[PDB]
Specification:
The complex is a heterodimer of chains A (260) and B (99). With 260 residues, chain A is of the alpha+beta class. Chain A is built from 2 helices and 16 strands. Chain B has one domain (1-99): Sandwich (Immunoglobulin-like). Classes of the chains: A alpha+beta (260), B mainly beta (99). Chain A: Disulfide bonds join 98-148, 107-130, 187-243.
């Protein structure tokens, strides 16, 4: 029942010539829902959202536009503070957002920064706490934190069809003779939704490791993700090995037996 | 301070000649955001190519998805060309309809 909203921020300074470049991509779970960068008046939002009839996105557009504008000042003081060559181009990555589950009055807030890939201290308490006592959008808006929980709900209400989705993987194994004295078995899982998924190879009922190959799960580009796991096996020993696919949209962990 | 990119080339849907699809080149785990990615059909920089909006993983490394709408054939060969500061020379990975 938990859901999360995140805003990934990135600012890159241009050695001397010009103003810094930046971008802010907003995600909800594993779906992108917002975008805003150097040169764009307002933020472009996922088409698949009910859009605007007068839709109040102000609070956001406001917070974001500000965060963006300030990128330069931010870049400078980090440089100053650490006196790094202004001849070089440094980047500033910043992560904010929250995890939420109303039926547990649970709101977790995140605020992580990093300069040139190095983390910047917090001593603020990693995930802090936010609130869900909605009703009125105050005058103390500057702060995104105070709105995270709300902004999330709006997105969920405006994307129910895509956000509250859950497409299980479609699996199948492919055999590829390894003219090297062995055979390779590849377990495919395609078009599944939440990217979190796990594949394993079991031999005679045992997890198989150190002899298997895994690829970072990748986006299909269509809104789902793909991933596959493979293993090398002695000729005709096919039916011996089995593949297991665990996933959120699966009623039960899917088990595969060589292409049939 | 720097991280070389991981590349992956694949099709949106299972490769099947004569039928429309999408060629994908996926770059991740690389750092300095600046990166150059091109898709190649028989070796030529493909015309219309779009990519996702820049973003980064937990470890702060970035990742992008370059893609193009295409229709494969038993002959036409496709590949992806990635250029980054961490590279001595450009890197090219050939598409493979099985991997």
């Amino acid at each position: 029942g938990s859901h999360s909203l995140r805003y990934f921020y990135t600012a890159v300074s241009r050695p001397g010539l010009g103003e810094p470049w930046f971008i802010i991509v907003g995600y909800v779970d594993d779906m992108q829902v917002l975008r805003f960068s150097s040169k764009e008046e307002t933020p472009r939002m996922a088409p698949w959202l009910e859009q605007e009839e007068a839709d109040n996105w102000e609070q956001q557009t406001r917070i974001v536009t500000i965060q963006g504008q300030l990128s330069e000042r931010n870049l400078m003081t980090l440089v100053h503070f650490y006196n790094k060559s202004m001849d070089d181009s440094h980047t500033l990555q910043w992560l904010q957002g929250c995890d939420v589950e109303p039926d547990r009055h649970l709101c977790l807030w995140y605020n992580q920064l990093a300069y040139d890939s190095e983390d910047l201290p917090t001593l603020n308490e990693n995930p802090s706490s936010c609130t869900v006592g909605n009703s009125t959008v105050p005058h103390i808006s500057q702060d995104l934190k105070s709105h995270c929980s709300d902004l999330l709900q709006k997105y969920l209400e405006k994307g129910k069809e895509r956000l509250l989705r859950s497409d299980p993987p479609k699996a199948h194994v492919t055999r590829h003779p390894r003219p090297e004295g062995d055979v390779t078995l590849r377990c495919w899982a395609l078009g599944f939704y939440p990217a979190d998924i796990t594949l394993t190879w079991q031999l005679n009922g045992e997890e198989l490791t150190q002899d298997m190959e895994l690829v970072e799960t990748r986006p299909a580009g269509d809104g789902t993700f793909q991933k596959w796991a493979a293993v090398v096996v002695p000729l005709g020993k096919e039916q011996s090995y089995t593949c297991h696919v665990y996933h959120e949209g699966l009623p039960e962990p899917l088990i595969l037996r060589w292409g049939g | 301070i720097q991280r070389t990119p991981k590349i992956q080339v694949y099709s949106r849907h299972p490769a099947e000649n004569g039928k429309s699809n999408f060629l994908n080149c996926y770059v991740s785990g690389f750092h300095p955001s600046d990166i150059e990615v091109d898709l190649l059909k028989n070796g030529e920089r493909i015309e219309k190519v779009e990519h996702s909006d820049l973003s980064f993983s937990k470890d702060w490394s970035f990742y992008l998805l370059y893609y193009t709408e295409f229709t494969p054939t038993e002959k036409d060969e496709y590949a992806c060309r990635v250029n980054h500061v961490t590279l001595s020379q450009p890197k090219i990975v050939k598409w493979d309809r099985d991997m």
